Scaffold this active site. Structure first.
Site, PDB file in Angstrom:
ATOM      1  CG  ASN A 162      -1.965   1.040   1.260  1.00 49.32           C
ATOM      2  OD1 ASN A 162      -2.437   1.375   2.353  1.00 49.32           O
ATOM      3  ND2 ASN A 162      -2.448   1.628   0.140  1.00 49.32           N
ATOM      4  CE1 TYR A 218      -9.364   7.940   0.966  1.00 47.77           C
ATOM      5  CE2 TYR A 218      -8.319   7.413  -1.136  1.00 47.77           C
ATOM      6  CZ  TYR A 218      -8.403   7.281   0.224  1.00 47.77           C
ATOM      7  OH  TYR A 218      -7.486   6.492   0.836  1.00 47.77           O
ATOM      8  CD  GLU A 270      -4.968   4.761  -1.123  1.00 49.16           C
ATOM      9  OE1 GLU A 270      -5.393   5.914  -1.021  1.00 49.16           O
ATOM     10  OE2 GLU A 270      -5.156   3.918  -0.242  1.00 49.16           O
ATOM     11  CD  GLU A 308      -7.427   8.484   4.335  1.00 49.87           C
ATOM     12  OE1 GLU A 308      -8.110   7.626   4.899  1.00 49.87           O
ATOM     13  OE2 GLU A 308      -6.274   8.247   3.975  1.00 49.87           O
ATOM     14  CE1 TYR A 329      -5.913  10.076   1.129  1.00 51.55           C
ATOM     15  CE2 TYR A 329      -3.719  11.058   0.860  1.00 51.55           C
ATOM     16  CZ  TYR A 329      -4.614  10.273   1.578  1.00 51.55           C
ATOM     17  OH  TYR A 329      -4.226   9.686   2.773  1.00 51.55           O
TER      18      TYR A 329
END
Length: 190
Positions: free
Chosen positions: A44, A88, A177, A86, A77
């Site tokens: 990741n 997106y 990502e 967070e 992001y």
């Protein structure tokens, strides 16, 4: 320019590249708004260029190519603090649908497509502040694309009236990502 994980600037643009330590990624800063990320059997990682801080009214331009082979996202992001958020707004993605897991809260039309709006909660995950619990807000573009403009205001406003508050803005990046996959992308921000 084959940089290892970090934060900084490289010609008026902030860059942030984070990964879990797994091998497989190479992140290159190009001039101005450009970066390349190439990954084969990654872990990741989140990589991208943009602004520190971001704003609630930035209209962000991006072009280039995004060629995922498995689980990956191309998104605007970023984060906010107090509350820790967070968020997106995903323009395109690979084989794994980002809404798996999510609670759908609504829709918004912006820059040529409606987007579906979702909220999820990460529990004791890395954040900008260290291990934390935080809500994750998402706008998923129905009509996927690899270049365009995003008027962020539309998404933050929609999120707001569905009850998804945002605090003080931290970084705001166009990011690719990846989650344990392979791909290629070359993108330029402005």
């Amino acid at each position: 320019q084959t940089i290892g994980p970090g934060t900084g600037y490289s010609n008026g643009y902030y860059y942030s590249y984070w990964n879990d330590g797994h091998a497989g990624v190479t992140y290159t800063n190009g001039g101005g708004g450009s970066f390349t990320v190439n990954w084969s059997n990654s872990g990741n990682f989140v990589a991208g260029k943009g602004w520190q801080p971001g704003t609630k009214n930035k209209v962000i331009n991006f072009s280039g190519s995004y060629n995922p082979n498995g689980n990956s996202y191309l998104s605007i992001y970023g984060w906010s603090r107090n509350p820790l958020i967070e968020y997106y707004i995903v323009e395109n993605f690979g084989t794994y649908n980002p809404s798996t897991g999510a609670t759908k809260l609504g829709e918004v039309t912006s820059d040529g497509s409606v987007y579906d709006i979702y909220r999820t909660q990460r529990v004791n995950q890395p954040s900008i502040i260290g291990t934390a619990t935080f809500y994750q807000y998402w706008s998923v573009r129905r009509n996927h694309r690899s270049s365009g403009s995003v008027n962020t205001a539309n998404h933050f406003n929609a999120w707001a009236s569905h009850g998804l508050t945002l605090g003080t803005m931290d970084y705001q990046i166009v990011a690719v990502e990846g989650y344990f996959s392979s791909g290629s992308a070359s993108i330029t921000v402005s």
